[PDB]
Every structure is written in structure tokens, then in C-alpha cells.
Amino acid sequence: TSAVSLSATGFYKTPNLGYSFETNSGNPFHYFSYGVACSEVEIDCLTG
Amino acid sequence: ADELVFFVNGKKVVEKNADPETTLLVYLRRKLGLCGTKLGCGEGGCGACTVMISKYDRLQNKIVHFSVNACLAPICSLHHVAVTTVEGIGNTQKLHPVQERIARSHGSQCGFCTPGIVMSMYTLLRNQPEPTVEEIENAFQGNLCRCTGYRPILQGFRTFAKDLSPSLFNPEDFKPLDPTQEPIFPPELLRLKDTPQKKLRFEGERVTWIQASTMEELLDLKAQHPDAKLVVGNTEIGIEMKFKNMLFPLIVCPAWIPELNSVVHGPEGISFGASCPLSLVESVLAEEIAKLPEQKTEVFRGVMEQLRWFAGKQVKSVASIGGNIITASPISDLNPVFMASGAKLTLVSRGTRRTVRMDHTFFPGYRKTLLRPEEILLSIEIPYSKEGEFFSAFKQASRREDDIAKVTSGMRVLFKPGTIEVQELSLCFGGMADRTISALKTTPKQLSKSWNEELLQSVCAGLAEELQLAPDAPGGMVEFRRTLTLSFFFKFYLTVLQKLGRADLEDMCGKLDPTFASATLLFQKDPPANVQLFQEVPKDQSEEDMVGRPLPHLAANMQASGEAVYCDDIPRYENELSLRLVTSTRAHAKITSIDTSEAKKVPGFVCFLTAEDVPNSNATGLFNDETVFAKDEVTCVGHIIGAVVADTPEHAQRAARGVKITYEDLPAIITIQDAINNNSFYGSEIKIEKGDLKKGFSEADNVVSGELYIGGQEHFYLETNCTIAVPKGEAGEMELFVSTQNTMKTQSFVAKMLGVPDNRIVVRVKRMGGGFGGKETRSTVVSTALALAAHKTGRPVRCMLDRDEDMLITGGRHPFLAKYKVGFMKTGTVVALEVAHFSNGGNTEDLSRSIMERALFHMDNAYKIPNIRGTGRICKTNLPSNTAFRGFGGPQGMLIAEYWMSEVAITCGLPAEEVRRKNMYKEGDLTHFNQKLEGFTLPRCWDECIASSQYLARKREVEKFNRENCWKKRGLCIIPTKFGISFTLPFLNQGGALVHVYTDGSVLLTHGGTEMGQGLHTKMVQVASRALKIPTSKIHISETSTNTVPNTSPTAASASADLNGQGVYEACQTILKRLEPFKKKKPTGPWEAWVMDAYTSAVSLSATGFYKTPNLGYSFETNSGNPFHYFSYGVACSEVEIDCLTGDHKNLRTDIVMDVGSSLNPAIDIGQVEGAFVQGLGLFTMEELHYSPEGSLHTRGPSTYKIPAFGSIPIEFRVSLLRDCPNKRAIYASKAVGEPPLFLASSIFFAIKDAIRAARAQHGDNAKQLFQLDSPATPEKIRNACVDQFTTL
Amino acid sequence: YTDGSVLLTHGGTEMGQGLHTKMVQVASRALKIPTSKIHISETSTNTVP
Amino acid sequence: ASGEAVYCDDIPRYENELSLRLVTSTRAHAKITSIDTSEAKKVPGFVCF
């Protein structure tokens, strides 16, 4: 009722990225994910 | 099991189970998917459904083409014919010349009437490739357009005929017509023309249709089954079936029978088979009249005179003469003529044949004839006139009731040869009784009398007595109708005088006084002359900057082609249901019970929805005082009680008829007077007051007091209200496609009814076929009901209202009652004014209060009044709720001002234009509400109009015409206007937009405004193209949606281009800012490179835009603050000529000068001036709504509610937009245009008033000087004010 | 909207990963209102290009 | 879990809606020497290839 807009756009771009294959420089990634898994199996040597 | 076989746009249709109730319009739209042909009324009056038919005519041996109303053509009547629709002539990839010309000439605004007009013009050209201007105009008698003011349509099409300012269009650029490229007549049909016609039978759900090939077959059928209903053109039967609930289970169509279609010239006259269409009657009698002695064709000319203002080409091409005769309507225009001339009817049944002579016994009772149930009408011989035998025919114009109370007459005299003495005299009338009658007691008494003043006087006394009407007779207008019988005989009397003159009996009968001659003239057209003037843009302006250029409406080509999509053109989902509203038949009552037992038996019935089914809240409407569905009590005729849902529209309608509802009446408050007496009002008195009233009236040389009533108005948007609601099945989500100016309120009201948040509900509007205020709020009454059905069923549901329903339910402009007192000097200067206003608001508040405020804000019109008091009360009544209508209270307020102003001038004995001018504000003055008038261009508009209309010189001609004519009079008036721009509710002055640029460079824009024919999207694209500096071609607007721009105000208050234009401009400035760094690097490289560079640099190419009108907000308590951002100004000068004997009148010339600031688009803005002016013209002169004494609307369609027609517009029609007047506070210095010109049509009202004043000085005797003329000034009111020997006794 | 409800959309599409769920959680923290007041209906080229 | 969620094919058909079926290569690498559509044209409701 005060005539203020209640609609908005939003935007984002990941900064500082850019790798060069020619000079082997520049960051391709913003950050890295990391994890580790331990697994155990039992095989049947006669069937696969 | 007979197949029905016909062609549509060249393609063969084979219908194996044709239902006789199926119309061609329904079949085209719903079976074939061809939605260019529209429904606008369903009763033959609007022509929106016009299509062309071609066939091989076996009787004339050749291919013929004619137009028809698709809404009334049973498909069962169409075996072996070829239909052509708008889609069959061209499309946007190759427009037919007819489509091209109407588009390019700015003849299409909302676009809904465009296809039907295109088809009427197209059919004309297939028959006459080189028509005349006259033929072109006659082509459209059956086509209505509510937006354009008709001028541009006729002007564009005039290019097919007569065989400083830039221009609005260029005819030299129009492609030429090549007739060889029209569609081939289907060769299959030429093959079949050879084989004999067989009787067919078609069986539908309820109706059996036999297409009789032979007289034998028809007679056998009627002998054995006398109940079999003849249908020939269906132009009466269709109405009875569709709107009067009637059902004839067995129908026989005899249209193919050679004997019913023959024309035979015999010694006494010409015989027409009874099934001959009126169009064949017309072309034969025309040619007889052209080639024969005048003395023989007197009757033929009377028939032709009646066929002139009868219906359109569409109706006449299939309406039979026998059908008019046998329908026996009390207001048949033809039967009075056939009766007066003793036309010879042959009747037959199996083994019988007899001839009679139409006389009073032919019609023994209401809609009855002499025919036995087994007989049919074979032929009517229309007779040659004899030496000494003379004939006139007459017809009231104006029509108010379905069936009754329009006068129409046939009159005949035979003189003993060589004498002036009467051998035979016959005077027959419709609209005076429940059937066509003969003045049988009056005529005998004049036998052997001489044609003289004694006979005139004798016949008038007889007529008055013999045809006398009770004060309460059916149809009212009893004083007018009486006067017409007498006035029509007078004309006949004078005309026979003349005709005896021409037979050299002048010395026995006398000369006619030459001031009486104009009384007897047959209506003569006069060729149209138009001028449109506007301003060229600067010479330096880029060619790609379209702001200020006359760019055609961006959808005009698709509208001409039938490709533009309106709501009901959207294809149905396979699971879609249809809804039909059930409304109250009482003005105020308790609902005692509802029985749906008959409704449940209709096949496809799904449910009846009522208030109990509403999920959340039944309280709706702008001020929360309305029911979605009535609960316990109805409060108008039209109050929506519930809604039937069924698989198809036909089943919904039949099922709604089986909802039987039971009432106990309650005290009803109907009229403004009823409300005043009962203290029934919406809220308190509203008031504006300035200066000292007691002093002003004390200082005034004169004081005049009076009242004025102003009738209401139906919007008659060509597209009625329509909603499709589509439930999505998740989270309460629903999408609605609606013909509405108000997406926001539609969304909110739906969400509150359902009890879900607003974020679940999306409302979409591509375009409306007109709105005009009618769809600002009252569209939600359909929307909420449909949304509920969709929610309940989980299925898509659709409702488009029939015209009768829409006219009943949705209300109109507010009627006004004013009580005024004005005080003024001898010089004409007004010093004091007090006006009490009352409006009839109907049964909901809606916008009624804001409407009253606008009327009060305009009670000054253009005039500075130092001491002033206005009040208004808004009456609360048991009628449909009235709402916004273009003007929004302004026109009512300003008509009241001009009305007391007219009386100030007459009381001072001074020229009205001088009096207006000297009371006009000047630059810097304050209004009565204390707003200052800056940039006041009204005097410039006034002076330009006075000069270019040659007002003073025309005044002198009008005076002279009036001194030289006793029975016609002219009048001339010039009227100004001032119109405040912005919503009366300040926070509604806001708008938003959203813009995207895609990586190809193309731009998708949207904004809060909706397109309803005013060219808003076009304007926004013009604006965006200038703002962005790219061509309009790269910018597109597809639709309006609550999920792209939220919280939008309705498209109203003429404000939408101002508000959305600023929103658009700001959205565009945001995008330009972000592209700036790329522009700098690449200042030449094209737009597409900047866009792609920004994209690949990860810069956002999407933006919102928003505007609020600043510094607004008026206070009623302190009478300060600005309610308006700026004001519109304009002046119109109009001239009229009235028929003092009939009440009819011609609009001879109108000249308008309008301040639209620096127009965004002068083509669209001129079109809005003309459109608005013509709606005003209807408001003040033609449009009259009529109600039973118990509050039931009788006037529900174009047969009874008469909007301006092609033939209504001023014959010379000039419009200029004021030059050099930038308004820099609105978008690119424009002004809004939609509403301000409407009130300028009051110029025609006041010109009629001048003409009446002159008629009164001519024949009045003691006439009251300040006589009464309420609005609308219809033929009734004009005729009754022309007091004379005929009105007095 | 004027009832306080929020309609949100973004470029991302839901394919089972709970993107919309995460976006509403994000919006509700950002706006400091409950997730119940925020809805995402769909992804469309005419709302985010 | 309720089957209320709408995926593309769950959307109701329009009454006038048509169906498409792709026609693909049965060869890894080849010239197309001709296409014969005569048998396809005889299937009821066939519109176009």
C-alpha cells in the first residue's frame, strides 16, 4: 500500500575461475569435495 | 443413418450422426477446431460468427456465394454446400487483401469482431469485385464493433470502392486483389449437382430433422404429422430454441423444394415462393422498381423501405418471406405492408389448395394465423399498384421489448379515378397490439371524402380512439407510440398531397407548404467525409524509434486472420468439463429449497455446486460483501446461487434448467427513489465544498433549480466473460486463463475461496475481446465458480457466458439522479452551485464509492465556480451490482454540469459557447478540490476546434435550416472536458515489469497490464525499443501473468501505459547499465555481440522494473492533496438533424480536438478517441436498459439493447490530436487517452437539445422554456419533447 | 504476494536431488520466515533466462 | 508416495493432441538410398512422416 515493489531478481557467478591448458595455470574449481569409503566383499570363486 | 456431407475451407466433412440441434458455429469451433469464427451473441445481431456459404443453385443454374450467421445455421441445413471461414481466405503467412487492409488501416482493436467483418467484406467482393461506397457500408448492417468507432474499417475498405499531418496508413502499399486465386468451388459438389436430391433424415439426442426434397413429401409429412415444425432459415426458430427454452422434436426443412423458391411475374403482381430469402425478394423488387413505371411499384417500394433498416446481409440471405409472415410477430415490419396492400397468399395441404388476401382475419391472435396445422404457405403475390393508388411504409426505430411495442406500418389509398376523393383506404400497424392490425373502424369513415385538412383531422381522431393504449399497456412508451401512429399518418397525408401534385391534381388538393416538404423525404445517407490529423515525429528521430509513429496494433494481422487466441479458442483438455451458472429469478427472497432431481437425469451431469461446497470462505468481492454462491437469501435477479458441472456446454445448460428453486419474497429496494425512501446506501455521504454558498446565491442575479436522470450502460464487450481453470493436483496449485483486466484480484479471490495461499494460484491473460471496466472486478464471479469446480473434480473446467447471462449477471455503468441549484449573473458568469448526486449501486459495493468520488471530482467539468457544494450518496439496491465503465463516474458528473450550463445560457439569452468560454478555468486556477491546473491546454483545444469546425458559420446555417423547415430541425453544440488521470485510490498508481534478454539477442517482456484492444502491448514494445535502442522486431510480449509480475493494479483508469511504460523503461535501463562495459569495448559491434559477451562474462540479462506515481493523495476532510497526476483536455463540436415527427436523428458532423500530449502512437490514440466517443454516443442517445417493475433486466441482447452501428457514426468525423504539447511527467511526454474522450459525445446530446428547443418554438404555443431531457435522449424522449398538434390531443 | 506468501523460482530443475527443498530452506533462512510460506512450482525459461 | 506428483506424461492430453514416434537407423554407417512410407500411410490415424 506504500507502492514498494515486492518482486526481485537474484543472480550469482562463481568468481575467479579459469584454467589454461596452454600455461597449466588458473583455477578450474571453486573448491573440492572429499570422502573415503571402506568396503568388504565375499566372492564365490566357483561362480563369480 | 443418412450422412451429412458438406465442405469447410475446401475440405470434405462427412458427419455420420448429425444432431439437428448442432449449429455450424459449434461444429466449426468444437468439432473442427476452427476458432477464428466467434460467438458474440447467439441471436444474429452482432455478426461475429459470419461465414460464407457457396453452393450450386439448381434453380438459377450456377455457383452462388452468400454470408450467414454461423450461430443460427443448423448444420443439418447445410448438406452439399461449401463453407468458407476466416481461416479459408488467408493467414498471417499470406493475408487476403481484405485481412491486410482492415489490419493496416487500424480497423482492428480488440480484434473479436474482425473475422466476422472480414467475412462480410469478403463475401461482398466475391459477388461484386468492384463495389460502391454505399454497397460497402450496407455490407456491415449485421456486424457490430464496440471498440473502433467504425471509421477506420470503412476508410480502409473504401480502397476497394468508387467503381501538415502524416497519414495513418498508406493504400498505395496494399496488394491488389486477384480473384483467380480464391478457393475452387469443390468439384465434387459440381459432380453431385447432377444427381437428384433425396429426402434426408437426421436423428439427434432430442430432435428429428427431415430435409424434404419434394412438395409431395412435405405435404404427406404434414398430413400425417401436423406437428412437424417447418424450419427454413432458422432465424426465428433458432432463437425460440436457444433462448425461449422451446423444443420441437420433429422438424421438417422444405428449403430445397423448387415450388417454395420460385419467382413468377403475373398480371396483378409478383409471386414469391414462401421459402425465398429476403435477399432474393430485395434483388427482384429492386430491379422491377428500376425498370417499371413509378405508378406500378408503389407497394414494392414500401417493402424495400421496410427491408432497409431490417437486419444484415447475413440474416437476409437465409430469412424467408414466408417465415416472417408465419412467425406472426406483433412487430413484423412486413405483415403490415402485406396486409395494407391485400397481398395474395396461397395455402396448401395434401389434396387442398386455397388463396386468401391478407386482412385482419389472417392473424386472429397472438402469433397465430389462418393456417390449419396441416397447411403450409406456398406463395405471396406482392401486387402492382394501380393508377391513383399510393403507398407508404413506416417504422419506429428503437426497440425495447422482445416482441411488442415498436410501431411499424403499411398505408395505402386508392382515389376514384380523375378525383381526389377516396375509393379505398387501408392503415395497418404493428407494435400497437398483440398482433398486426388494421384501423378497420377508422378507414370506412373516409370513403368518398376528399384528401384535405378535414380528412387529416378525422383520421387522427379515429386513430387515437381506435388504437388507444392503456397507461399500463405491454411495452410502455404509450405516449410515444400513440404519437407515432398519428405522425406516421401525417407523413402519409403530406406525401399523398405531393403525389396528387405530380398527377396534376394540385388545384383540387393544393400545394404543400414548402417548409413542410422535408417531412416526407425518405432517409438519405450523404457520403462520409473524415479527417484525422496528428503530428509528425522529429526529422532526426531514428527510423527504428517507433515512439510517436502510427505503428499498427501488433496483433492486427492475426486478429484479421482469426489466428489470435482468446480464452474460449484455447483447445479443451480431453478430461475438461463445462460449467453453467444458476442465478436467482427474484430481486429479494429467501431460498426455501433447491431441487436438482431433474438436473441429475441430464446425460453427463457431474454435480451442482452451492455455498456448502466452498472450501474456505464464501465472502468475496472488493469490499467483502458478496457471496460466491447465495446463502439463504437472493438479493437481485441474477444473483448466483450455484453452478452445474457437466461434460458439455449443452448438457450444462439443460441441467441448469432442471435446478428448480423455491422462494419466499422479501421487501425489495429497486429504484434510486426506493433507496432514498428506505435510507438504503453504501456508507456515508461524500462531499466536496468550497467558498460560501449562502453568499453566492444571495449575490446571483438568477437561480435555476432542477433534476436530471442519467441511464446506465452495458459494456457489450464483444467477448463475454470466460475462465478456464486447470487444477494441477499438487499442493493446491491451479492455473487460470481468464478474460480479465484484474489478474491480482482474480488470484486473491480464488485463493481465499479455496483457502490456499496466493503463491499456489496463477492467473494468465493473453488478451480480452474488450473490457471497458466490465472486467475490472465482475469477471471474478465466473472465475471463482470455475476454480471451485476444477478443485472439486480434479479436472479442468471451463465457462464462457452467453450474452444474455453476461448482460444479466455482470452489471454496468451506474445510473445517476442529480438535484441541482445554480446561481449566475446576467452575463452568464456562474457564482454558485449545489448538486446532490445519487447512484444506483445494485447489491454489492464493488467500486461504487470510488465512482462517486470521480463524479464529484468532475462536477466542475471545465468551469471555475467560486462557491460550490457537491454531495453524493450511493444507493444500495436489489439489482445486479454496477461497476466500472470507461469514464468511471466522470461522464455522469460532467453531463450534469453541462446540463445546468445549457440552462444558464438559455436563461441569460446568450450564445452557449460564450457562456461556457467565459466560465472556463484558466492556467493556475484551483479546482473546487484545490488542485492547481498547470499545463492547461483546454483553451488551445477550444480555439482550434471552434476554428477548424467553422462553428460560427455553421451556426448561421443551422438557424436558416430551422427557419425554412417545419418538421426537421438542426442543432449544433460545442463541449469541452477536463479529465483527471490516476486511480482515485493512490496506491493503485503503481506498475511493474519483467524483462529477459536471451543469448540470441531477442527480448521477452511482460508487464502488469492486460491487452483488451487498446494497444497497450504495442505501446510497451514501442517504449522498450526506444529505451533499449533496438528495433521493435527484437522485442515480444506474449502474455500477462501473476507469476511474472505480482501485485498488479487492474488495467483501468486509463493509466496502464503511463504506469507500465515507466516500469518497462526502468527494466530496460537496468539492462542497458549492465551492457555498458561491453558497449564501450565494442561500440560498433552489433547488439547480439554485446548480449553474448555479457552472457559469457556471467552478467545477468534479466531485470524487474517498477514505478509508482509520485505525490498523490487527496483528503476529503481537509480538501487538499492532489488526487491526479495531470489532466486530459479535449473539445468536441457536433451537429445533428432531428425528425420532429419520429424522434430519429442523423449525426451530421463531429469535430474533436484532443490533448494526448506527445502521443506514443497516434494511430492507436486516434482509434481510442473515436472508440470512446462512439461509446459515449451510445450512452447519451441510444443505449437504454429496461427492467420489470420487480427488478428483472429485460434488455439482454442486441435485439433489444442497441449499441452504435456502422450507420450511427457522425457522417463527417474529424479528429485532431493537439500539436506541440509534451507532458513530461508521463512516459516520453504522452498522456493517457482511453477514458477522457467519451464524455465529448455529450456534444451530440446538447445538439439534440438545441434542435428540440427549435422544434418547440416552432409548434409548442406556451411551451415550458427549461424543458426536460433525461439521458439517454432516445427517439421516444426526443419525439415526446417535440410538442405539437399530434402530442397534445 | 499481498497475503505474505512467497512464490520462488530459480534456474535449477528437480530431478530427485531435492534442489527445490534446499532452495526453500535457503530462502526461509534468508527471509526469516517459515518454509511453509514459500513455494516453488516449476522451472521455466520465461521466469529465469 | 501418493501418486499425486505430476511428471510430464501425467499431464492430461488436449482433445486435439497427437503422438509422435521416432524412426531410427538400423545401420552403423550407411547412405540412405530411399524411404518408403506406403505401409505407414495405411495405419489408421496416421498423419505425417
Ligand SMILES: Cc1cc2nc3c(=O)[nH]c(=O)nc-3n(C[C@H](O)[C@H](O)[C@H](O)COP(=O)(O)OP(=O)(O)OC[C@H]3O[C@@H](n4cnc5c(N)ncnc54)[C@H](O)[C@@H]3O)c2cc1C
Ligand atoms: C438479427 C435479426 C434481425 C431481424 N430483424 C427483423 C426486422 O427488422 N423486421 C422483421 O419483421 N423481422 C426481423 N427479423 C425476423 C426475421 O425476418 C424472421 O426471423 C425471418 O424472416 C424468419 O424466416 P426464417 O426462414 O428464418 O424462418 P424459420 O425461423 O425457419 O421459421 C419461422 C416460422 O415460420 C414457419 N414457417 C416457415 N416457412 C413456412 C411455410 N412455408 N409455411 C408455414 N410455416 C412456415 C416455421 O414453422 C416457424 O414457425 C429479424 C431476425 C433476426 C435474427
Ligand SMILES: O=c1[nH]c(=O)c2[nH]c(=O)[nH]c2[nH]1
Ligand atoms: O480512478 C479510477 N479508478 C478506477 O478503478 C477506474 N476504473 C476505470 O475504468 N476508470 C477508473 N478510474
Ligand code: FES
Ligand atoms: S454470434 Fe452470431 S450474430 Fe452474434
Ligand code: FES
Ligand atoms: S475491435 Fe471490434 S469489437 Fe473490439
Ligand SMILES: [Ca+2]
Ligand atoms: Ca456496485
